[PDB]
Amino acid sequence: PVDFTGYWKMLVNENFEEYLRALDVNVALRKIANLLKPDKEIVQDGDHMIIRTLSTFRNYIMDFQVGKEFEEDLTGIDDRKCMTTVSWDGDKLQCVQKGEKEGRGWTQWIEGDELHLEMRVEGVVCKQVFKKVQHH
Ligand SMILES: C=C(C)[C@@H]1CCC(C)=C[C@H]1c1c(O)cc(C)cc1O
C-alpha cells in the first residue's frame, strides 16, 4: 500500500538545468531554480492527491484525481498548459503531460523513507529524491 502523504525535504536534484532547458526556460531562471531546495507537502486522500512544492519565494501546487485527465497549468515553471493524467502503475505514480513537448511526464515512488521523482521531457531526464521529515 503506497501512501505519499507526508512532509518531504529535498535531498538531491540531478540534472534539473538540462530538464528546464528542454522546456525552453531561459538560463537565468534555470540557475535560480536549480539553487532552490523546496519541500513537498503531500496529502493522498483516496485517489485525490494534493502535492504542494514549497519554497520561500516560489511555490507550485498540483491538485488532481488519480486516473482522471485534467488541464495542468504549469504557471511559474515553463508557463505551458498540458492535458495531464496521473495514473497508478503498481506502486508507482505515472504522470503523462500531453502538450507541445514530446515525452513530457514524471514518475513518483517511495523507497523506505525516500520519495523518488523522475521527470522527463524530449528524452532529457532529471531525478529528485526527498526525505520524509517530521518538523512542520
Ligand atoms: C520551488 C519551485 C516550485 C520552483 C519554481 C520555479 C521552477 C522553474 C521550478 C520549481 C522547482 C521544483 O519544482 C523542484 C525543485 C527541486 C526545484 C525547483 O526550483
From Swiss-Prot:
Task: Report the record's Gene Ontology biological process terms.
Answer: fatty acid transport; lipid homeostasis; retinoic acid biosynthetic process; vitamin A metabolic process
* Region ranges (Important for interaction with STRA6): 21-31
Listed InterPro entries? Calycin (IPR012674), CRBP1 (IPR031264), Fatty_acid-bd (IPR000463), ILBP (IPR031259), Lipocln_cytosolic_FA-bd_dom (IPR000566)
What's the impact of mutating residue 108 to L? Strongly decreased affinity for retinol. Further decrease in for retinol
Tissue localization of expression: Detected in nearly all the tissues with higher expression in adult ovary, pancreas, pituitary gland and adrenal gland, and fetal liver.
Q: Where in the cell is it found?
A: Cytoplasm; Lipid droplet
- Consequence when changing residue 31 to A: No effect on retinol binding. Abolishes interaction with STA6 and the ability to enhance STA6-mediated vitamin A uptake
Task: Write out the GO cellular component annotations.
Answer: cytosol; lipid droplet; nucleoplasm; nucleus
One family from Pfam that matches here is: Lipocalin
Q: Where are the disulfide bridges?
A: none
Effect recorded for residue 40 to L: Strongly decreased affinity for retinol. Further decrease in affinity for retinol
Q: Which residues bind all-trans-retinol?
A: 40, 62, 108
- Primary localisation category: cytoplasm
GO terms (molecular function) for this protein are:
all-trans-retinol binding; fatty acid binding; retinal binding; retinoid binding
On whether Cytoplasm is a keyword of this UniProt record, the answer is yes
Which controlled-vocabulary keywords does the entry list?
Cytoplasm, Lipid droplet, Methylation, Retinol-binding, Transport, Vitamin A
Function comment: Cytoplasmic retinol-binding protein. Accepts retinol from the transport protein STRA6, and thereby contributes to retinol uptake, storage and retinoid homeostasis.
The record's comment about this protein's domains reads: Forms a beta-barrel structure that accommodates hydrophobic ligands in its interior.
Q: Give the family from UniProt.
A: Belongs to the calycin superfamily. Fatty-acid binding protein (FABP) family.
Q: Please identify the protein, giving its name as recorded.
A: Retinol-binding protein 1
- Source organism per UniProt: Homo sapiens (Human)
